[PDB]
Design an enzyme around this catalytic site. Structure first.
Site, PDB file in Angstrom:
ATOM      1  N   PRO A   1      44.246  44.152  37.646  1.00  0.00           N
ATOM      2  CA  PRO A   1      43.395  42.985  37.512  1.00  0.00           C
ATOM      3  C   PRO A   1      41.942  43.327  37.234  1.00  0.00           C
ATOM      4  CG  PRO A   1      44.289  43.047  39.716  1.00  0.00           C
ATOM      5  CD  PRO A   1      44.705  44.329  39.032  1.00  0.00           C
ATOM      6  N   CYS A   2      41.708  43.986  36.079  1.00  0.00           N
ATOM      7  CA  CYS A   2      40.361  44.358  35.676  1.00  0.00           C
ATOM      8  C   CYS A   2      39.452  43.213  35.318  1.00  0.00           C
ATOM      9  CB  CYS A   2      40.421  45.361  34.510  1.00  0.00           C
ATOM     10  SG  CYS A   2      41.035  44.614  32.987  1.00  0.00           S
ATOM     11  N   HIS A   3      39.921  41.988  35.236  1.00  0.00           N
ATOM     12  CA  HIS A   3      39.161  40.804  35.018  1.00  0.00           C
ATOM     13  C   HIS A   3      38.375  40.448  36.291  1.00  0.00           C
ATOM     14  CE1 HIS A   3      43.252  39.836  36.264  1.00  0.00           C
ATOM     15  NE2 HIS A   3      42.778  38.711  36.787  1.00  0.00           N
TER      16      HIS A   3
END
Length: 165
Positions: free
Chosen positions: A134-136
């Site tokens: 979940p790099c967002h």
């Protein structure tokens, strides 16, 4: 090194799902197939489509399901490739709760290297497994949504769906 891929539609637009023999090895988001396929070819060069692989096409439908839902974990095995540092950064992204954001510096602080903010920033933009990793959820601290590998519109869209009601 066999890598299989498929292109499908999802809430975030066009996505490319790729699978090696270890697990999902790439989840890429975009607007047009040509670019997704060269982006994938850059990291997995003789990757080919596999429309008749019944068992791959099922896995793609499983991956898509995660992708369109707010907080549906991807169970299938992941083929995460990268350096220890990248792996440390990506593993700690995965412990960010759905609905929260941490700044790069907090993330650098949490993994024991307060100093390495730049390299943490780069590790996030090098993620090859959109959404699942979940790099967002990591943000520069200044209020901007820059830094996403697949653009501001998708980062913003993702954060808006997880911070709901």
């Amino acid at each position: 090194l066999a890598v299989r891929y498929a292109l499908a539609d999802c809430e975030l637009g066009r996505c490319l799902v790729a699978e090696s023999e270890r697990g999902i090895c790439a989840i890429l988001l975009g607007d047009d197939d040509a670019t997704l396929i060269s982006e994938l070819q850059q990291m997995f060069p003789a990757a080919d489509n596999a429309p008749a692989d019944l068992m791959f096409q099922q896995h793609v439908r499983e991956v898509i399901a995660s992708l369109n839902q707010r907080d549906t974990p991807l169970t299938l095995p992941l083929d995460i490739r990268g350096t220890a540092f990248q792996q440390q950064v990506w593993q700690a992204l995965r412990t960010i709760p759905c609905g929260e954001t941490v700044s790069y510096q907090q993330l650098a602080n949490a993994i024991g290297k307060p100093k390495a903010v730049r390299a943490v920033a780069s590790a996030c933009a090098a993620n090859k497994l959109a959404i699942v990793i979940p790099c967002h959820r990591v943000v520069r601290g200044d209020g901007s949504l820059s830094g996403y590998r697949w653009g501001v519109s998708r980062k913003a869209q993702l954060l808006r769906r997880e911070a709901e009601n």
